[PDB]
Amino acid sequence: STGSATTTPIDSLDDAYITPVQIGTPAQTLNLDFDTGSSDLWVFSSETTASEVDGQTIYTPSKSTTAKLLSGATWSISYGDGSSSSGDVYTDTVSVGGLTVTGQAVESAKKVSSSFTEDSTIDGLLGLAFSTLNTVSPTQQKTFFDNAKASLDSPVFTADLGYHAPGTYNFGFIDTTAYTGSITYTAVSTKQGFWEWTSTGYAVGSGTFKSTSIDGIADTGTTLLYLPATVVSAYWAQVSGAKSSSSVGGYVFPCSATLPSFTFGVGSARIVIPGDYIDFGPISTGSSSCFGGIQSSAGIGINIFGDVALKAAFVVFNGATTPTLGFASK
Numbered sequence: 001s002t003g004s005a006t007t008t009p010i011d012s013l014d015d016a017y018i019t020p021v022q023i024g025t026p027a028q029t030l031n032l033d034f035d036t037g038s039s040d041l042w043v044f045s046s047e048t049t050a051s052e053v054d055g056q057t058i059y060t061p062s063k064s065t066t067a068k069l070l071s072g073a074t075w076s077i078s079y080g081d082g083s084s085s086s087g088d089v090y091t092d093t094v095s096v097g098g099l100t101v102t103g104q105a106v107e108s109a110k111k112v113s114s115s116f117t118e119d120s121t122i123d124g125l126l127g128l129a130f131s132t133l134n135t136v137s138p139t140q141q142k143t144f145f146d147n148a149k150a151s152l153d154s155p156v157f158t159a160d161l162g163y164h165a166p167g168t169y170n171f172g173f174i175d176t177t178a179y180t181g182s183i184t185y186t187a188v189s190t191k192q193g194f195w196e197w198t199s200t201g202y203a204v205g206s207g208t209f210k211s212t213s214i215d216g217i218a219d220t221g222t223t224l225l226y227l228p229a230t231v232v233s234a235y236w237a238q239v240s241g242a243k244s245s246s247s248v249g250g251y252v253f254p255c256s257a258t259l260p261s262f263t264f265g266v267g268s269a270r271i272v273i274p275g276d277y278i279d280f281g282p283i284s285t286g287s288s289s290c291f292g293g294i295q296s297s298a299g300i301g302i303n304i305f306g307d308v309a310l311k312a313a314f315v316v317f318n319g320a321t322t323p324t325l326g327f328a329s330k
């Protein structure tokens with residue numbers, strides 16, 4: 001079987017993407033953030049503290065004839081940006097774009113951090129990293145992808161994120177009309193639970209390509225591109241007036257500047273990120289300083305190929321027994 005769902009940016013900056021997901025019987029439709037950097041499916045629910053809910057659609061297990069409380073199970077998660085949430089665990093039927101999994105662990109948030117409360121358009125997260133990162137205790141739970149793997153025509157899903165436009169998550173098949181040229185596959189390390197791979201280098205604008213290994217993770221749940229300080233400094237040096245601001249927490253640049261493109265290597269192939277993708281707009285309403293989409297990973301400890309990079313490509317997450325990542329131009 002297969003599944004296919006449209007994913008839509010939540011705002012005009014492509015800060016995140018939401019995808020409708022059907023949970024329960026009868027279906028309750030929630031808009032979830034598909035996150036290949038985490039492995040928990042958690043939702044705002046009727047059990048969430050009422051003051052921590054501001055416009056979200058909530059999952060109500062008591063109205064689902066297929067929901068079962070997973071006795072004694074709890075979950076607690078903290079994301080790399082400081083966000084967190086926690087609660088209890090149900091099992092229920094979950095469907096994405098026609099692809100149905102029964103007995104999926106649905107983690108019901110009793111408490112959420114402020115950053116989720118303020119994001120009225122995101123009803124929860126759907127983790128798509130490896131199940132070793134799932135936070136359910138005492139019994140670890142499998143991701144939606146892991147549960148679906150057996151019935152999928154092919155153990156893959158693909159991410160086709162749009163620039164200021166809707167995109168597609170496909171499960172179980174590779175749409176050969178969605179990209180140009182060939183798909184270049186590269187090896188994945190699962191030792192930390194992430195879709196971790198090694199990029200073969202980079203180029204700034206029309207400059208020479210610098211062959212150098214950059215280890216990082218493919219993370220649809222992170223907005224920006226986080227790279228080593230040496231790379232990020234070489235990019236922003238080509239933007240007149242750009243500077244790293246400690247008060248802002250990263251590189252900013254004059255909104256009137258034109259940004260050079262950024263190329264990253266996948267094996268022998270090259271993925272070009274247009275300079276317009278790196279502009280994340282004024283740091284405050286009316287400001288003439290704009291926030292950059294390429295930032296240093298030094299404070300983070302891991303390099304992150306977030307949405308800025310991934311939306312420049314058609315990306316195959318190959319969940320075969322030896323997993324690989326595929327990249328194609330589009």
Ligand SMILES: NCc1ccc(C(F)(F)F)cc1
Binds near residue numbers: 081
């Ligand atoms: N998108 C989920 C996520 C969030 C943070 C991290 C970090 F910061 F730990 F690398 C990885 C993955």
Ligand SMILES: NCc1ccc(C(F)(F)F)cc1
Binds near residue numbers: 037038081119221
């Ligand atoms: N990387 C996971 C993640 C995704 C979204 C959010 C936000 F924006 F909703 F706070 C935080 C953390």
